[PDB]
């Protein structure tokens, strides 16, 4: 609440904080109590176009695109320092907006700092290659250039984190960007723009559009001047975006959902598996793309595991993200909670069992909030929708498997392939499994970790491209082969 | 004679599709007649596959990929197989070149050069197969091991054009096999000859059942299965912009990656301080090799005003002497265009140009000469008095046609050259190399040639900026379209987090 | 014997097969029976100089150094094909010259083929980099060039194998080379030069000097025109070479000996450990740089292990390398056998036990040959010379250890660091150990494997630089930074 | 000024500032006036050993070597920030100690900052590779580890700059180091150690020895526990160091002298060439390893060029490095000035001409200082010592050439190959030349620039290895190939 007293309420376009073209606004809600906490501009599609054209003009002027990579790196480092300096405030702002615990928000800010720092350090390390030309008397080189104008669209679950993954490499490479956060959670994204403005970037290099994807999204994906669309969100929106981007053969980087398996063998450290099954399923109320919603447990320990998990789920402390006792916060919106509730009806209807949870909590201090009980669904199989689809709530399904081959089959039996885990003390076995899983990230005896040093993204329908790591940077670069003939000779193919 | 020998080849050439290790007919036994553009005679009849055939191939590729017979084979061994394919190309170099000239109509010498490139393309990728399996990352988390493993992407569909059939096919096949993917290829319905032949050769080398598949058919009938089937992990397409957009939209249904190699409106920038005769020679080469039916064609000539009049005159005079004829005759400098339909598009573009106010300085019609009457020939053409706002300048005609525009300054040449939706390739001619470098840096093109025109090679990536494409072919980047990264993170000292209560 | 009827007996200098400058010769001996089997030229130091000057002239002419990398790659591939084509004959020639089994020689030829093929494929893959310059209006690039003239010196144990590791990358990069094999084993090296000549290389690009290192070695290491000395041999010779190479600040790549540990935990697959302890200690009669001469076995199974090993050592079949029943051949020379024998006296004198072997075999069919029984030395410790020094014979020492830390400490307690192994079914433990071992190569549950795809070399005193892999190629390249100022301006630091 | 009042006077060993073991000291002299300005400890060989053993102990404890690369990077960044924070004081300290102008010292500090920043950013970017193993059922990976204990020896010309090139990558990779600056110029090196201590590194990770290479140098190059010797200095000292390092097969990185050509064609921008010839020859009174001491000018403009250069040399303002008017300071020592003077006698005796300078300046305010006039030597040829040898003073030679081929031949006609330049408006020609020059760095239309992003080092006798760039980091890393057999099988080569 104090934090918002000086926070900007507007969009940032072509170096100026401006309102929506039609002065329209939107109320931002705190999911803990559903109170309106802040009011921001609700931009129009013309605002998005104007931002894009400004990014284009700025890119062509070359003030940022022709700046030395070393200097661009120092600026990105400066942004990183700002994140660390305002770490406390940013974490509170994110907990206020998304509802997750304050400790989870602090960890985000540490990651974000590191994300910017990583890309700041990578900026001046690889400018292309020299090729040994197969043509005598020619020089061949590949220069890597910033792709140009980039649109960046993020989700509401980890707003600033997902924003950092896009902004950092865009600025490091010299691109101009136009970013639009989830309409429902713009707070930390607004704040980071204020911070980037303080660091100082050329007019038009960075732009912030605030609005609903349904209104402004198509301009951002289908405008002719966009060279790349980087999107993190749901599969249906990503498909739509890709179809639209095709109108101008615009490259896309998509970071979509997952149906991430958490494979638990009987030779796994049992208490560790239970601990990590809870972590995997319920951090941020399961509103995490890396969530371990699909638990695969070996039959010999399935019954014992289900019991232990259920018993633990019954003790999970729900509450306000600002209270240190809180272990799980509310879900993001009314709409989202409704989808979760409909999924419970779907599960019962297909023949599955709600072993625990599956409803709103009764407790007094939670009535006003968008809470939903941590849930465990049993007696289910791969043919069911509750197992195949991304619920994105505090819900997990438990399936049994007999053999190592069967666990692999089940784990890969989904349209997705973002991330997953394998728990077993037999490391050789965990490696065999990891190798056969069609997942962008595989954890052996762990669950959730990602970091700037390594690429993150999907196999199959969890995405296209990668974020983080050197590959994350490559989404923002384009190669140019400049071939110079040092002893040009007439070919005389067409008779003189 | 050389014609005769090319035609003899057809009597042993397969007429069918290659699916799941078997040469088979179309599911409905339908067929198609292949035509030689030099005389329009039917020269061969092949199967015309159905969409079900394409699905069956895709499912076979999937089954083969999952069995691991190729995907789990050692990279070194995969490299040897790809090298074996390369050796086949060289061994059958003569026959393949004649087959390509017969099918596409381009000169035999141009076809020989293709076969040399193709050999080298396979050889390059054969050598690259076992060189980079991923990375070891220094993890920021103590007591963890972090590594990135690069795996073959899976099932890949490959679609090619009629201009340089085997060349474009090699750019896709080589890295696919080198990385361990399974593939389903469909060449242009109009030119399947060399693609069929290369499959016979790949079969001789020996690959596991389903690893390679050849579908023969029209993109309008089987294309959507190849781009929109759930089991496809990557669609690699080389063709026109409209088809590519359609493909990308369809591939989106399953969030399927795409690599697109589309057209271009490639500038050939000529400064007054360029070696004049060299610029004229390369303007002709740029515009008329393969009758301008080349994606790297220099259709848009930008010449500095001080030498524009002198240049136009020299170019026109040279265009009047270009020898047209049969690709098999050594005297032939330019062959026919590929089809009736395509020649008609070119003819309509001449009407478009006159209607916008441009001038057909020379050519712009079918040649009269007797020995060319039966063929799909079209005269090499030069269009003058035109500007960037015109369709004849902005759009890819893909025929033996070039436009000439003047420019005063270096900045103006860059602006005109970048004033198109495309960005595949281009050239700069000037003896002032520093200037050519400044220009090259500002051109939004995947490939820029300084004092040259046309060269590409396996060692370096080829592809577009802007609407000329997505992704790259050739070079290490060409191989990366066929790989997918996996981050395997191992916690070597796992500890409970105890976030959730007791 | 028939193989030698057409084999050249001369040196190859500046495109010509020539005799020694003083017509001196040397008799080559078959260690199986000590019979003279061939006579070759014994070159003079002036021959070595002439070769070096020819390599220099050839390098400067640019016929090979300026040839396209792609074409160079095809030539190296052609050499590879020759190896495969003459595989049978080469293997027999190596068994005749070195005395190792024919099967071991066949495996060498397969490796060699692959070594050339690997480097043939690597030739045109990396010509340098484009750097993002921190100075505005400048272009910065790094071009990688062949280093120039290279001298290559090899040992008698695996003559052609060690030669291939040097020749392949030298030719692939465009260098000129002068090679000198061990004076006692020149057969396969001569043959490969005949084969390289058939392929065709420009005059002076390749040169073969035949002679004793004590006579011609110093020219090869200390001549001003040499840019790199690549040496594979013993530590003392390497030190001498490095000292001499210093006279002209000449780069060196050294591949020296080792005291390679073979660590066996009690949770190792017991029979596998015994099998690999034998393999590690007795392939090629222990005359291998990767030999597992130092066995470290966990105390709990030490007694059982020693007994099993000893019993197996007593059944090792000695004989002629050409007989299929032969499991271990003779040692290379009288001199070398004598060193091994004196090491037995050294061991007894320090208080160690010759548990088995330690002498020449009695059997009739072995009397004439340079045989020495496979040996096991027990009751020894790290302070002993028999444990610290490279015997390079069919001999192994057995030391016990209690803990994982103690095994690491003992394994690292030597001046060397070439290779080693860890045997345990607990893979996590084997990884912890592997990470702490100061060895260029570590095998987990295996012993001996190397391959072109990966670099091989030492930590500590086992060497300087690497052979094989991309790093192997880098020993033959030198970087040049070409910086172009595209907008040169006077600095005017000094008064006008 | 007051800068020295708080500056430490001692060595830094094993986390403690300590005196020499024998309490011996040394007086530091300001070359501007030859006054003693500071007194520091003069360490013994035992001190150097103790530092080395402390570095070893620290490396094995793993407090720094096992720290995450990301964290190591942050520390190196912290050092970089210290340099920028104390830039003023450091620059004055370097001008006081070395005598060069204050502006030159400020530029150094900017470079140094950037050197540390670059390596800070490179620290966590490449930990090794995954190899596609040719052996089925095996995993192959290459891990890059810090090499271990490193000794670093620097010259007196650019003390802190040369130190930064070694310290930055050493710390970034996780090595322990023992540094010894030139005995005559320890001021900035002492200061940077105080700064590194403030940042905080584990006990023994960094050590500073102060001495005389003739007394402590051999311990630093020949001690068994050293894994790498990084040396920047003269060729004779480097050779000595290499020979000594050989005793323990210790890797060496040598950055030695040069006889750098400055090639000037008749189609060069004339005034630019004259300006850069002066810069190349007289910055820091020619006491720079990248000095353009050997001018090669095309005959058609040779006479005109010599006249213009001479006229400009006559106006060079000599004086105190602290005075803004000063363009060139004094030379470092009496001994060094004497060497320069004897080289003038050598030049006259071989038949060359001292066209201008070649003596001490007469002006009053320079009488007390170690000044020497900027000099130009004409009518000389490649056979002369004045042309072949590194004088390392404010001296340049001028040679004529007719053709492009002749310029290349003359430029490469020396034992060295560190750096050089080509001046011509015909860029294509400058590229042809640059390609043929055997130099680690080639400047086209510029002279002197180096930067962290690109490797610097020599061809031929100018050195071994590289500093700066990724290659600079690689001198501090060693590769380990860990091969795991995932399906181990008995080989059964030996009888059961
Ligand atoms: N590190 C590895 O990759 C590797 C591989 C195989 C063998 N090796 C080692 O090599 C050794 C093989 O034994 P060796 O007896 O052949 O070694 P050696 O040092 O006695 O002989 C090696 C080579 O050096 C030559 N030589 C002798 N004096 C020389 C001199 N003064 N200057 C230059 N060259 C001179 C010899 O003629 C011979 O060609 C063993 O120590 C073994 O461990 C190492």
Residue A494 carries which DSSP code? S
Would you say how long chain C is, in residues?
496
Same domain, A167 and A302: no
C462 CA distance to ligand 1 centroid (A)? 12
Nearest CA in chain D to A120: D121
Beta bridge partners of C30: C35
Q: Is D289 marked active-site?
A: yes
State how far the Cα of A239 lies from the Cα of D134, in Å rounded to an integer. 40
> Which residues does C14 contact at the CB level (< 8 Å), separation at least 6?
C50, C51, C54, C203, C204, C207
In order, the DSSP letters of D313-367 are HTTPPB--TTSTT-SB---S-HHHHHHHHHHHHHHHHHT-EEEE--S----GGGT
Distance CA C19, CA C191 (A): 16
- Under DSSP, is residue A257 helix (H, G, I), strand (E, B) or coil? coil
Beta carbons of B406 and B386 less than 8 angstroms apart: no
Element (H, E) at A150: strand A149-153
C392 lines ligand 1 (CB under 6 A): yes
Closest C-alpha to C48, from C12, C16, C7: C12
Residues B328 and B212 in one domain: no
Find the helix or strand (DSSP H, E) in which C441 lies: strand C441-444
Same domain? D86 vs D115: yes
Label residue D27 exposed, middle or buried (CB < 10 Å: 0-12, 13-18, 19+): exposed
Which of C28, C237, C395 has most ligand 1 atoms within 8 Å of CB, for mutation? Answer: C237
Least CB–CB distance from B499: residue in A279, A444, A479: A279
Say how far apart CA C198 and CA C201 lie, in whole Å. 9
Alpha-carbon distance of D93 to B369, in angstroms, equals 87
Say how many Å lie between the CA of residue B5 and the centre of ligand 1: 60
Crossing angle of helices B93-104 and B108-128, rounded to 10°: 120
H/E stretch holding A442 reads: strand A441-444
Which atom of ligand 1 lies closest to the CA of C240? 31
Which of C155, C283, C392 maximizes ligand 1 atoms within 8 Å of its Cβ, making it the mutation to test the pocket? C155
Q: What is the CATH number of the domain that holds A325?
A: 3.40.309.10
Atom of ligand 1 minimally distant from the CA of C237: 19
Quick one: C273 and C396 in the same domain? Answer: yes
Q: D445, D439 in Cβ contact below 8 A?
A: no
Lookup: tokens for A250:
């615009």
Ligand 1 pocket mutation pick from C151, C153, C233 by most atoms within 8 angstroms of CB: C233
Q: Is the CB of C418 under 6 A from ligand 1?
A: yes
Write down how long chain D is: 496
Question: Which residue owns the Cα nearest ligand 1 atom 26?
Answer: C213
Which strands make up the sheet holding B17-19, listed edge to edge? Answer: B22-24, B17-19, B212-214, B182-186, B155-159, B234-238, B257-261, B469-470
Q: Which of A205, A143, A155, A147 is nearest to A180 (CA)?
A: A155
* Nearest-CB residue to A70 (from D77, D114, D124): D114
Q: Which of B420, B437, B457 is the last residue of a domain?
A: B457
CB atoms within 10 A of CB B384: 20
DSSP string, A163-190: HHHHHHHHHHHT-EEEEE--TT--HHHH
Q: Which of D451, D468, D487 is a domain's end point?
A: D451
- Pocket flag, ligand 1, residue C256 (CB < 6 Å): yes
Q: Is the distance from CB of A220 to CB of A214 less than 8 angstroms?
A: no
Structure token pair of residue A249? 């053969």
Question: Cβ contacts of residue C89 below 8 Å, gap of 6+?
Answer: C3, C191
Question: How, if at all, do strands B22-24 and B17-19 pair?
Answer: antiparallel
In terms of domains, do D311 and D371 share one?
A: yes
**How far apart, in whole angstroms, are the C-alpha atoms of residue C107 and residue B140?**
42
How far apart are the CA of C233 and the centre of ligand 1, in A? 2
C212 Cα nearest atom in ligand 1? 37
Q: Give, in degrees to the nearest 5, the angle at Cα B119 between B115 and B125.
A: 140
Residue A462 gets which letter from DSSP?
A: G
Q: Of C279, C441, C480, which is closest to D491 when you measure between CB atoms?
A: C279
Do B272 and B431 form a contact (C-beta atoms < 8 A)?
Answer: no
Chains that touch D (3 or more CB pairs under 8 A): A, B, C
What are the residue ranges of helices labelled H in B229-377? 241-251, 276-288, 305-319, 340-356
| Total beta-carbon pairs less than 8 A apart between chain C and chain D | 235
Interchain CB distance below 8 Å, A442 and B318: no
Name the residue of chain A whose CA is nearest to C146's CA: A132
Radius of gyration over alpha carbons of chain A, in Å?
A: 24
Ligand 1 atom at shortest distance from the alpha carbon of C180 = 39
**At what resolution in Å was this solved?**
2.6
Separation of alpha carbons C284 and B217, rounded Å: 60
Residue C277, both tokens: 């302890």
CB contact under 8 A, D453 and C131: yes
Which sign, positive or negative, has the C-alpha torsion B291, B297, B299, B304?
negative
Same domain, C384 and C472: no
Q: Are A94 and A100 in contact (CB under 8 A)?
A: yes
- The residues pairing with B236 across neighbouring beta strands, listed in sequence order, are B158, B259
Cα(C151)–Cα(C175) distance, integer angstroms: 10
Contacts of A72 (CB under 8 A, 6+ apart): A64, A123, A124, A171, A172, A173, A174
Full residue range of the structural domain in which residue D134 is found: 1-257+452-496
Using the mean position of ligand 1's atoms as its centre, give its distance from the Cα of residue C337 in Å. Answer: 16
User: C213 alpha carbon to ligand 1 midpoint, in Å?
Assistant: 9
D79 and D197 housed in the same domain: yes
Q: Do D124 and B147 touch (CB under 8 A)?
A: no
Ligand 1 closest atom vs CA C255: 1
Ligand 1 atom nearest residue C291's Cα: 43
Q: Which two tokens stand for residue D414?
A: 């020396």
Among candidate residues B245, B236, B246, the one with its CA nearest the CA of residue B153 = B236
Residue numbers in C near D242 (CB within 8 A): 242-243, 245-246, 249
Task: Give partners of B (≥3 CB pairs < 8 A).
Answer: A, C, D
Distance from CA of D495 to the nearest CA of C (A): 6
If interface means Cβ-Cβ distance under 8 Å, which residues of chain C face chain A?
66, 68-71, 123-124, 126-136, 140-144, 427-428, 431
Smallest CA separation from ligand 1 atom 1, residue: C255
Give the number of beta-carbon pairs within 8 Å between B and C. Answer: 43
Q: In the annotation, is C289 catalytic?
A: yes
CA distance B120 to B167: 11
Looking at the partner chain, which of B79, B83, B459 has a beta carbon nearest the beta carbon of C124?
B459
The response to whether residue C463 sits with its C-beta less than 6 Å from ligand 1 reads: yes
What Cα–Cα distance (Å) separates residue C150 from each residue in C167, C230, D242, D255?
10, 7, 19, 21
Rounded to 10 degrees, the C-alpha dihedral D172/D173/D174/D179 comes to -70
d(C-alpha A171, C-alpha C381), whole Å: 60
CA distance C170 to A115: 42
Rounded to the nearest angstrom, the minimum Cα separation between D159 and chain C is 22
In angstroms, the Cα distances linking D69 to A123, B136, D120, D141 are 17, 13, 9, 19
Distance (Å, whole) CA B380 – CA B334: 9
The shortest C-alpha distance from B431 to chain A (Å) reads 10
Q: Which residue has the tokens 């001690």?
A: D223
Residues of D with CB under 8 A from a CB of B: 66, 68-71, 123-124, 126-136, 140-144, 426-428, 431
Q: Which three-class secondary structure state does DSSP give residue A143?
A: strand
The verdict on A382 and A276 lying in the same domain is yes
- DSSP states of B407-426: ESSHHHHHHHHH-SS--SEE
Count CB pairs under 8 A between chains A and D. Answer: 42
Kindly state the tokens that stand for A183: 């309409």
Phi, psi of C171 (to 5 degrees): -70, -40
**3-state secondary structure at position D17:** strand
Beta bridge partners of C485: C138
Across-strand partners of B486? B149
Q: Nearest CA of chain A to the CA of D288: how many Å?
A: 25
C393 and C496 both lie in a single domain: no
Looking up residue A239, the CATH number of its domain turns out to be 3.40.605.10
Way it was determined:
X-ray
Looking at the structure, tell me whether residues C134 and C189 fall in a common domain. yes
Nearest CA owner, ligand 1 atom 6: C289
Residue C184 near ligand 1, beta carbon < 6 Å = no
Number of separate domains in chain C: 2
Q: What does each C-alpha distance from D31 to D36, D42, D102, D212 come to in angstroms?
A: 9, 20, 14, 18
Is the CB–ligand 1 distance for residue C378 below 6 Å? no
| CA of residue C31 to ligand 1 center, whole Å | 18
Ligand 1 neighbour C234 (Cβ under 6 A): yes
The alpha-carbon gap from A72 to the nearest alpha carbon of chain B, in Å, equals: 19
Q: Which of C15, C13, C54 is nearest to C201 (CA)?
A: C15
Residue whose tokens read 């990688």: C144
Is the CB–ligand 1 distance for residue C393 below 6 Å?
A: no
> Is the same domain home to A224 and A305?
no
Mark yes or no for CB contact B289/A493 under 8 Å: yes
The answer on C60 and C91 residing in a single domain is yes
Closest residue in A to C136 (Cα–Cα): A68
């Amino acid at each position: 609440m104090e934090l918002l007293k000086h926070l900007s309420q507007r969009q940032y376009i072509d170096g100026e904080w401006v309102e929506s073209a039609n002065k329209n606004t939107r109320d931002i809600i705190n999911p803990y109590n559903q109170e309106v906490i802040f009011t921001v501009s609700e931009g129009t599609k013309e605002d998005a176009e104007r931002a894009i054209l400004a990014a284009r003009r700025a890119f062509e002027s070359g003030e940022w695109s022709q700046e030395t990579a070393e200097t661009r790196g120092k600026k990105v480092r400066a942004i990183a320092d700002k994140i660390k300096e305002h770490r406390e405030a940013l974490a509170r702002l994110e907990t206020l907006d998304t509802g997750k615990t304050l400790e989870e928000s602090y960890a985000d800010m540490d990651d974000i700092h590191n994300v910017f720092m990583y890309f700041a350090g990578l900026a001046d390390k690889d400018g292309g290659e020299m090729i040994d030309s197969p043509i005598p008397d020619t020089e061949s080189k590949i220069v890597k250039e910033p792709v140009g104008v980039v649109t960046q669209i993020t989700p509401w679950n980890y707003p600033l984190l997902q924003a950092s993954w896009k902004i950092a490499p865009a600025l490091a490479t010299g691109c101009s960007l136009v970013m639009k956060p989830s309409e429902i959670t713009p707070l930390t994204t607004i704040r980071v723009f204020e911070l980037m403005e303080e660091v100082g970037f050329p007019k038009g290099t960075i732009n912030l559009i605030l609005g609903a994807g349904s209104e402004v999204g198509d301009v951002m994906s289908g405008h002719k001047e966009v060279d790349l669309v980087s999107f993190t969100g749901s599969i249906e929106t990503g498909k739509h975006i890709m179809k639209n981007a095709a109108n101008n053969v615009t490259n896309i980087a998509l970071e979509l959902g997952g149906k991430n398996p958490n494979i638990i063998f009987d030779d796994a450290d049992f208490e560790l598996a239970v601990d990590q099954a809870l972590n995997g399923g319920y951090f941020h109320a399961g509103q995490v793309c890396s969530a371990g919603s699909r638990i695969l447990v070996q039959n010999s320990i399935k019954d014992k595991f289900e019991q232990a998990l259920i018993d633990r789920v019954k003790k999970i402390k729900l509450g306000n993200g600002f209270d240190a006792d809180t272990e799980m916060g509310p879900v993001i919106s009314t709409e989202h909670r409704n989808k979760i509730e409909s999924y419970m009806d779907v599960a019962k209807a297909e023949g599955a069992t709600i072993a625990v949870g599956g409803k709103r909590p009764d407790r007094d201090d939670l009535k006003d909030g968008l809470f939903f009980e941590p849930t465990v669904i049993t007696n289910c199989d791969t043919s069911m929708r509750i197992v195949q689809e991304e619920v994105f709530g505090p819900v997990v399904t438990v399936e049994g498997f007999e053999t190592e081959q069967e666990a692999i089959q089940l784990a890969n039996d989904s349209i997705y392939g973002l991330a997953g885990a394998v728990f077993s003390k037999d490391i050789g076995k965990a490696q065999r499994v990891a190798n056969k899983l069609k997942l962008g990230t595989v954890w052996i005896n762990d669950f959730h970790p990602y970091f700037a040093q390594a690429p993150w993204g999907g196999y199959k329908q969890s995405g296209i491209g990668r974020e983080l790591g050197k590959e994350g940077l490559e989404e923002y670069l384009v190669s140019k082969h400049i071939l110079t003939n040092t002893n040009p000779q007439l070919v005389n193919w067409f008779s003189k």
